[PDB]
Amino acid sequence: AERSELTIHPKEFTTFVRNFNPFLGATNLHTTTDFIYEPLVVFNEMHGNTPVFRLAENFQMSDDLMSVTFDIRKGVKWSDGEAFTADDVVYSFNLVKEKPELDQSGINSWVTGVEKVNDYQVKFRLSEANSNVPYEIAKVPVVPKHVWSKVKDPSTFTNENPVGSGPFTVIDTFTPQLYIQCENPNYWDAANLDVDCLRVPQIANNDQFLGKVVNGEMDWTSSFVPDIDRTYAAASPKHHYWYPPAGTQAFVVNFKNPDAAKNEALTNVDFRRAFSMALDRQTIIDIAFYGGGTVNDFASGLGYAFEAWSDEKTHDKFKAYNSYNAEGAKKLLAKAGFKDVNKDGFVDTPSGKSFELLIQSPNGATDFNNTVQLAVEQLAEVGIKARARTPDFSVYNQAMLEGTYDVAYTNYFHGADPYTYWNSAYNSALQSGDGMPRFAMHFYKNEKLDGLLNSFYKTADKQEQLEIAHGIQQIIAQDQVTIPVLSGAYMYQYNTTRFTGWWNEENPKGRPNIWAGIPERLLHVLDLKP
Ligand SMILES: CC(=O)N[C@@H]1[C@@H](O)[C@H](O[C@@H]2O[C@H](CO)[C@@H](O)[C@H](O)[C@H]2NC(C)=O)[C@@H](CO)O[C@H]1O
Ligand SMILES: [Ca+2]
Ligand SMILES: [Ca+2]
Ligand SMILES: [Cl-]
Ligand SMILES: [Mg+2]
């Protein structure tokens, strides 16, 4: 007699440290959000951000877009039996407010205050008009007041025995190499859930992963798999995958690099364009990603997923700078004044200084690693000296947060409209803060651009959104702020050996991936049956 264990892989680790604190995204385990702490609403981003109501049953914006009310579902219990109510929501937002350390999404710059209207209704007051704020609100973890009010210091609290609202709150097994997370005994949506436990094995990199997945040892994964047909697909007809289109991937350059020679090059827009034209994006896609991507030749990073949003006069004006043109790259370096003056074949800065660009991508992310090595070779052909680095994710991340890096290859989260990409990638407000992610850390700062970003949802009118879009697109393309390469894919592999009900090509219910930060994975696990 065997419980239905579902084997998932949301995040690389070399060893598991027991940490289920949903506010500490950089050091916690990646089954905490959604699976332990259910959100108020899941927005189905693949289906136009259609709201799927979970712990909330409704929300409504005020007419001036300066406040919003959430109705809380009745009958819901924490895993320890205690009732879930508006108090828990109000508490959670007050906690993040007082301790900005715990704000990983930037909610503190939208919500000025939160109040309980009654036991199942919460009101949010805004600092500024935002018709999209319910989406932002839904990113904040909601935790139980009767536990966290008694917590010491939440920013170091490891929360080893979690009390949660989600489907899997019980820590059945924990070891450095394996943990098993089982059904919440008081789960409100238990009738809808047919999986008994989440089984989470320790896997450090894509190499260790490839061995395990081809051998049929996984159920639900979202890792890069090299040569997936001959390696994994051909291993069994039970081995399936579905890779729908995802977000932008780019080389991001540090505008505040402390080295004089490097700073001179990186902050030069002719240099960023020459760098960009040296890249053979299609070769990166074919070789490093085995076809799993689309060329991104928008200087703004927009991508072909959102070409309806594109001001095509802006896109075509700067398109040439974001296509493969090695002769053009060499000519631009020459015109700009990046001349090789010490006879080694690599261009030097206008002030005569030699330099090498260190390009980083995360350890274990072999598709990104191979991308950077291909770029290093393509750059050398036009006389730009570069070297690849593959630091551990925490080191990669910290070096961006601190501004010590030169160039970083990174992907971005992908929304229902271009705002998820553009805001996270360019809003200068997101360049400061301990909880802040890496995405905005080039430290290019443009007050006009921030102004446009912060006004994107001042109205409900989508035609005025589209025009703000066009303004944003123009600013970023004009300055070639990053070097966009491709639009990636939501890599997703599923095994029909032990479970059915999977999302796929024929059943495209939403983003199918198992990563933290994909709230839809809650809704996906609810569709699975043994
Ligand atoms: C936007 C973002 O940061 N996404 C992260 C994912 O990219 C990442 O998944 C990893 O992506 C690598 C690059 O394509 C893959 O090589 C790697 O196999 C994959 N790892 C896993 C476990 O799926 C995840 C996890 O590191 O974090 C996301 O936030
Ligand atoms: Ca179900
Ligand atoms: Ca030289
Ligand atoms: Cl563009
Ligand atoms: Mg059930």
Author numbering: -1 to 528
From the paper:
These shifts may have altered the interaction of GlcNAc with amino acid side chains from the upper domain, including Trp513. As demonstrated from the crystal structure of W363A, the Trp513 side chain is shifted by the mutation of Trp363 by 0.6 Å, and the bound (GlcNAc)2 also shifted slightly. The mutational effects of Trp363 and Trp513 on ΔG° were similar (ΔΔG° = +4.7 ± 0.4 and +4.2 ± 0.3 kcal mol−1, respectively), but the effects of mutations on enthalpy/entropy contributions are significantly different between the two Trp mutants. The W363A mutation had a large effect on the enthalpic term, while in W513A, a large change was observed in the entropic contribution. Trp363 interacts purely through CH-π stacking, while Trp513 interacts through both CH-π stacking and hydrogen bonding with the N-acetyl group of the GlcNAc in site 1. Mutation of three conserved residues (Trp363, Asp365, and Trp513) to Ala resulted in drastic decreases in the binding affinity toward the preferred substrate (GlcNAc)2, indicating their significant contributions to sugar binding.
VhCBP is a periplasmic chitooligosaccharide-binding protein mainly responsible for translocation of the chitooligosaccharide (GlcNAc)2 across the double membranes of marine bacteria. The chitooligosaccharide-specific SBP is localized to the periplasmic compartment of the bacterial cell wall and serves as a mobile component of the (GlcNAc)2-specific ABC transporter. SBPs share a common structural feature comprising two domains connected by a flexible hinge region. VcCBP and VhCBP belong to cluster C/subcluster IV (C-IV), members of which are specific for oligosaccharides, including mannooligosaccharides, cellooligosaccharides, and chitooligosaccharides.
